[PDB]
Amino acid sequence: PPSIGIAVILVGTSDEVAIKDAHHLSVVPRVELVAMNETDPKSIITRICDLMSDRKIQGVVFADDTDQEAIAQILDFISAQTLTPILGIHGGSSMIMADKDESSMFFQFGPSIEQQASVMLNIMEEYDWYIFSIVTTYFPGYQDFVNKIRSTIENSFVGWELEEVLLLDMSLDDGDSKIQNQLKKLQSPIILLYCTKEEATYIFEVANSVGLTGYGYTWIVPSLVAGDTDTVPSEFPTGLISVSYDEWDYGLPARVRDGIAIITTAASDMLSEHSFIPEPKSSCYNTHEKRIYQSNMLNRYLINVTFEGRDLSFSEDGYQMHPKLVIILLNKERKWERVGKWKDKSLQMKYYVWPR
């Protein structure tokens, strides 16, 4: 059995111990844990380009401890230029990324924008909250988000009522109070908000100054806004609901475990059906030259992988197929309390009457 190099870049304080603690296929994984200090573009591109020359890495498992969705993007880039598979299993690396390259081989753990927004509607149904408005920025996915909502509302014999839908511009500043004006026009109990963590801190800070954080106002937001739960910006309204990847039930070493699983299994499958597995790029400083000699024939497999009795399959747009979701509620002590679980397409809530 031959050995494929699988690099595991764990960013920020992490226990290499349990990580290294946690596979009889047709090929064996030669794993190598690497830590990384920084997460700007030059750091991440460089760390990975270097590692790829030192060894022959056929895969990458990326985990970080931040709320930087731009890490997901930096990775997708890196992934597509070098044609190396990359798994963003935890962190910024794992945030919703909409419209990844065609040539990419970048997959993320966690639910797609389309799915979260579905989850957000099942909730609103449980509690017969049928009247609501949407607010998004221009963040990628915003269109998938609004459109997923709409085709649900449109195709439903339930009494939905989408009251308004605001698109806010954060490309420009707000020394003119343009946003404020828009927000002041909302008049609904529920408000689905799609944007980013740092975007939302600012939006709420403004939404407060128009009395929209109070009671009578409930805000639901997706995973990338909740971000990392041990960090709650002071301007997040208490009472805020949000979906979230169950970092509780399903923690890091378990993720790095399936990390190495998918890349190994998928490699096996391709040495089997084809008697070969694509050679890892020797260097990024040479991508124009060596391009006709590379492809994404491994995606066929990186997607459809069964392991330890679980379908760890991915979708087309590169997000996990059926992940376990927790629904969390920002409480009075400003800590995030679990209040529901999402399993198949079934949602189970803790409360029958919603908390204050």
């Binding site: 920084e38 750091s43 880039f77 991508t287």
Partner: protein, 355 residues
């Protein structure tokens, strides 16, 4: 001693670097520079996009550039929009016309001194008003750029209406299917949006079906009558050329002009922080960036070499000027210009197809 602000640029050749360097020098000359003074910081394109991104970081962002100008090479401006977009440093497109960059959702801090291809619709439109074509067929490639132009024209149509829009899979060679579907309709004005290689494909099929004859009007863009696309283009076709749209030098001079004015307008305000020096370790957007985009994005430079500089909501050039072209006896012949707002028909008569 004044504060030195750096502008950076990623340009085609060392001759153009020198032009940029000199454009800034003249801005420094033209302006009051007791408090702030510009410095020019440039590189040329890199072989692939990773090496490019990095070059941005090491060469430009390492010098705290407030802006980055970007042309083409002799490999797109995307790795540059991203790296720089990561911090909200404004990137100014000197020559790219693709419609991707008009999308604030992925190219947020991007503006250009040239309009995207899809904006040719504004001209095709004044053109339908002029020659009273009220019924048109629109044929576009089903790529981003294709849809961009379809989206753009339908906006202006809601006068003259669009009878059918026929979208086709890019890279296809036998369009006889699509074309015959268009032949059946009463309308005989046809508007095409497609690359060179897909222009060619349409143009042929269009001929073997006798639709490039007389009684047909073919209205197109610049891509559809450039290089390879001309080798099989039917006579009587009308098409456009973005005047100066490929003079890197003309556009360097004008971009630097606008940018130097914005930089000065900006420092009239307060709480202006410098961009982050270097990439390594910095992961916060430049705080002043979104303001500086706002200041650029609503700049106005009126006596500019490329004409009248002014940007729409998406950061795209407005009042761009087009040559109106007629393929006559297999020569591209100028029959007029679109001057930003008006069509101006010159002495050379238009020979339609058939004629």
């Amino acid at each position: 001693d004044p504060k030195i602000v750096n502008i950076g640029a990623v340009l085609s050749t060392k001759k153009h670097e020198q032009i940029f360097r000199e454009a800034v020098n003249q801005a420094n000359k033209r302006h009051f520079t007791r408090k702030i003074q510009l410095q020019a910081t440039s590189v040329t394109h890199r072989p692939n996009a990773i090496q490019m991104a990095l070059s941005v970081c090491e060469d430009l962002i390492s010098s705290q550039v407030y802006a980055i100008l970007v042309s083409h090479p002799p490999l797109t401006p995307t790795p540059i929009s991203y790296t720089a977009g990561f911090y909200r440093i404004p990137v100014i497109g000197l020559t790219t016309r693709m419609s991707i960059y008009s999308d604030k959702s992925i190219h947020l801090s991007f503006l250009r001194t040239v309009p995207p291809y899809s904006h040719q619709a504004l001209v095709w439109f004044e053109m339908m008003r002029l020659f009273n074509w009220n019924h048109v067929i629109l044929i576009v490639s089903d790529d981003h750029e294709g849809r961009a132009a379809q989206k753009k024209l339908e906006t202006l149509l809601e006068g003259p209406k669009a009878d059918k829009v026929l979208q086709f899979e890019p890279g296809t060679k036998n369009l006889t299917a699509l074309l015959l579907e268009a032949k059946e309709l009463e309308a005989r004005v046809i508007i095409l949006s497609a690359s060179e290689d897909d222009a060619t494909a349409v143009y042929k099929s269009a001929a073997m079906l006798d639709m490039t004859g007389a009684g047909y009007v073919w209205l197109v863009g610049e891509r559809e009558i450039s290089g390879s696309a001309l080798r099989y283009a039917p006579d009587g076709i009308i098409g456009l050329q973005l005047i100066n749209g490929k003079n890197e030098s003309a556009h360097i001079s004008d971009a630097v002009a606008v940018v130097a004015q914005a930089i000065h307008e900006l420092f009239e305000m307060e709480n202006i922080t410098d961009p982050p020096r270097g990439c390594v370790g910095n992961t916060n957007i430049w705080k002043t960036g979104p303001l500086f985009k706002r200041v650029l994005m609503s700049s106005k430079y009126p006596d500019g070499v490329t004409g009248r500089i002014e940007f729409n909501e998406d950061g795209d050039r407005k009042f761009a000027q087009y040559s109106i072209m007629n393929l006559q006896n297999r020569k591209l012949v100028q029959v007029g210009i679109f001057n930003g707002s008006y069509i101006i028909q010159n002495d050379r008569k238009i020979i339609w197809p058939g004629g």
